[PDB]
């Protein structure tokens, strides 16, 4: 029969278009892929005024509000602070929320089992004006956190500039790339804040700008704290020119249940000696944390990739031609 | 034909289970997979009172003995310390293990190739009665790395609690997960420890059970250092509700031969100014590291992968659809 | 005819050969493969003696020049720095490049939209003899950071020690190894240089020899930043034993256009309290950074890979039963 001679020929020239479409040039097979090898550095350029009661204008620049402050890829810019300062080792009473005591009897001498903030001397000394806490040896005073500033105090935040400077190397090929390849120039870098269409490859972003693309409000995510990522991946051509390789930035929110657990937050202390006592100022800072993530592959012409996905294909076409049978009559 | 018939039959059936079960049952293939973005934040609450002999009663906070004091995976707790109080740049008699000369004459001018110490004024000054150092332009009390303390002088760093925070997010299916589960409560948190068994979920950890659970004695790694490992995995299908997406927390000891490098130690700063004058307190820390490793898979069902493993079952089938006929 | 048959099992056998030796010996598909979980702590061993003009001698450590300082895999070694040191917080000139007003109208109280620097008093203040900038309100000495030393100044990195401690463990096989084997003692340890073809296991670096072997100058990288990084790469099978296991250490040189932010810097500031005072001494440092990234694979024998890749044998045999029947039609 003839019908199904012709309808197996064109089912076999179908196996034939598709294999060649896909092989080649959809998988791009004849090409051989090797990964990156990558480093990223981080400028933070911006200045925060706060003005506290009770204390003078304080300055935050680039080495106060970043805190690796050596240009790690994950690091934190300093939203919101609570700050105390002056403090010493002595004995204090302890922040009511650990514990309390309504009497000097009830407290016993020790440490405690979770949540210690020192030991208990356990003569109970007042804390508040009506209800008294444990005295423990620890620095003091003790720091009190019930109490968030709405306003967040670094609200400026939100038109902080970074500058991601990414370099990435592969070794297969031996070829090194950055961030800044090719079109950047002294006088592009001075006037381009990143957007999404109008200027992609520039390496200056607003912090403000990716906490709005991340999908999160930069006032909310400023006065708790927040999580944003920045993922770099590099889709580079080795058979193409290398102007052609550009890096693509994709920027996430991880983000939680806000009634347990909100925001992102550490506490630090700075240690000085002064008057031969020596002290420290702790502040607890609320800050949106950055993680930069760089992925890439790269991709090259080989020969025997080529071979490899050339026998795969006289493989599929034995598939298709096994099957007549001798016409199966 | 019917003595093998019922064999063919047989086989055509096991390729066809091998094909609805192992490779589309198990190994899912109706479902696409992604990877997520991870980011942790680890939070330590504990208090030592160390008393030292010259220094008094010293107080370690969560500021004071996490290094990193803003939150990373790599983070290191302060166990075990030796402090040279009040450096002052002058000139001074090396450490004995540097070098040992018994005239001045010995000694020469320049700075040491191997574990330099300052740069030698050409003069030998006695370290003591015992035995004469070269001298040293650089710090003036050199700091003596031989003594280390038997009892840790953090020795309570086994009960204080690790806090880890793991947020997760899968952009390909845009689902955003946190390791604390829906299961978790504040009023849980108030008063939980976790256990592999008894409180799987719990995200606070006490750094002595990882230290157990990571097979390493906490005594041992706090005198002289150590590595643990923890690793967060998160397996979650998204076909059923997301209620069902939780971590599993493994702990590994990374150890080594105690008798060459025993631990893990560094040296680390910190600056003053004092009388007009700028000086350091030198600690050299013995804490163990925690390194956090996140690895997760989801898998969301999907028209095209289906289809695929649809396709390929045809020809698994296929090598047995062959006949015994010329 | 004879000829096709012995053609036919001529090309059965030669398929079965290559099925022997590519799938089983080759790529070791008889052999199960983990992963590992690694860390890397890093020691710095080297002192940097730096006097400047007006200024007593500054003597550098492991932990001056080491800026995590915590054994981070990911390190900068100081290489020179610009210092400011005595910043309070008081009104002073801004920075030339920042702003020039030639007069106090010109000035205008606020903020800088980029690269701000203070608020704006609206004055014109003579930063210097000849021109003069904006007031604002920040750091009294502005880091006039536009003489980056020639020389380096910690030039004696040169010659400095680095100690990297690699520990990894494959928990499927439950084996713990590091980067100090069996040919590595104490004595090796004490004057060991590493040379990649002398001492392959030295765990001893010199990070001039590092920068060296990455492709890039040592005195330039010194100069203005660089970035250099190391892969430790685990590939061994536990069949045999783990003495046999040896780590590769591979060195990196990742650089760009010169003419566009060279090379790596970072500011940093040491706060203190003299005379009552909050004080500061702010640092700009161009420095070498160094990544660790290690990736390793183990193997070992099991029954369940050998099954498959016997199975997966018959399947290329079966298709030489039929590979040249096909071919069989003239
Ligand atoms: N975070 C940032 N925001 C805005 N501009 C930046 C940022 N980081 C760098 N630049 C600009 O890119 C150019 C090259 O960057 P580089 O890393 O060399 O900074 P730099 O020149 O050392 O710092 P400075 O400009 O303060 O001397 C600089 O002229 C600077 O103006
Ligand atoms: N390491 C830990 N051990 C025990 N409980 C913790 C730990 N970290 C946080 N918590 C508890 O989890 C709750 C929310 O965590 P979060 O990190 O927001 O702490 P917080 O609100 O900043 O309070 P704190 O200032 O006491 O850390 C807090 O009430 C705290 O008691
Ligand atoms: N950067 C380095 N360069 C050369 N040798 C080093 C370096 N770091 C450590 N070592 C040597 O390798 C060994 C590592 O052991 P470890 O670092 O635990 O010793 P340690 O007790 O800290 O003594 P040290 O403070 O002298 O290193 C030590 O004997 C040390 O002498
Ligand atoms: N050792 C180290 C250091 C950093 C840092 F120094 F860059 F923060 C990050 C990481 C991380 F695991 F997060 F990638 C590891
Ligand atoms: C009592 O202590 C609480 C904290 O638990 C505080 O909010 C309140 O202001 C105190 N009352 C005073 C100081 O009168
Ligand atoms: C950020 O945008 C402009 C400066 O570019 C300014 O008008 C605005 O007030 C800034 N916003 C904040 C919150 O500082
Ligand atoms: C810098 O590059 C941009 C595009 O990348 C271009 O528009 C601009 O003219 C360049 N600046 C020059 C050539 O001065
Ligand atoms: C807290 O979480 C635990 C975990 O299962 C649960 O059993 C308990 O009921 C929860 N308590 C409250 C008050 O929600
Ligand atoms: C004064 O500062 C300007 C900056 O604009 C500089 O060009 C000039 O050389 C400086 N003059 C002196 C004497 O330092
Ligand atoms: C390193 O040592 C060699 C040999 O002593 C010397 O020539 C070179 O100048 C040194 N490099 C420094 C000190 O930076
Ligand atoms: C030290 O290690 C080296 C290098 O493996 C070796 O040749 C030497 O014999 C070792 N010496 C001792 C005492 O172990
Ligand atoms: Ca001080
Ligand atoms: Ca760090
Ligand atoms: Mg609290
Ligand atoms: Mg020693
Ligand atoms: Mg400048």
């Known amino acids: 029969n003839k019908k199904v001679g012709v309808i197996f020929r064109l089912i076999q020239l179908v196996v034939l278009v598709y294999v060649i ?11 051989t892929s090797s990964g990156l090898i990558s480093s990223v550095s981080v400028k933070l350029k911006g200045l925060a005024v706060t003005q506290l009661q009770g204390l003078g204008p304080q300055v935050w620049d680039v080495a106060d509000y970043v805190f690796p402050a050596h240009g790690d890829s994950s690091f934190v810019v300093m939203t919101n602070f609570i700050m105390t300062p002056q403090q010493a080792q002595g004995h204090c009473a302890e922040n009511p929320e650990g514990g309390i005591c309504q009497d000097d009897s009830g407290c016993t001498p020790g440490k405690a089992e979770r949540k210690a903030q020192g030991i208990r001397t356990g003569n109970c000394v007042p804390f508040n004006g009506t209800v008294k806490t444990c005295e423990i040896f620890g620095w003091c005073p003790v720091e009190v956190d019930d109490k968030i500033p709405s306003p967040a105090l ?29 079109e950047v120039n002294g006088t592009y870098m001075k006037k381009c804040l990143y957007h999404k269409i109008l200027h992609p490859l520039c390496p200056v972003f607003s912090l403000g700008y990716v906490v709005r693309e991340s999908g999160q409000d930069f006032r909310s995510l400023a006065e708790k704290g927040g999580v944003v990522g920045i993922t770099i991946d590099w889709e580079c051509d080795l058979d193409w020119h290398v102007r052609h390789c550009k890096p693509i930035y994709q920027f996430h929110g991880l983000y939680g249940e806000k009634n347990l ?25 609320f800050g949106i944390r ?24 006289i493989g599929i076409f034995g598939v298709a031609t096994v099957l007549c049978d001798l016409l199966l009559l």
């Open 154 to 182: 670094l609200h400026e935040a939100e038109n902080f500039t970074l500058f991601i400077k990414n370099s990435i190397s592969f070794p297969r090929f031996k070829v090194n790339r950055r961030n800044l390849v090719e």
């Open 290 to 313: 950055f993680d930069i993530l760089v992925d890439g592959k790269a991709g090259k012409f080989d020969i025997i990739p080529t071979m490899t996905t050339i026998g795969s294909g």
């Open 21 to 31: 479409g896909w092989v080649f040039v959809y998988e791009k097979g004849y090409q």
């Open 261 to 285: 657990s909100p925001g992102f937050n550490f506490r630090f202390a700075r240690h000085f000696v002064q008057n031969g006592t020596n002290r420290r100022h702790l502040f607890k800072v």
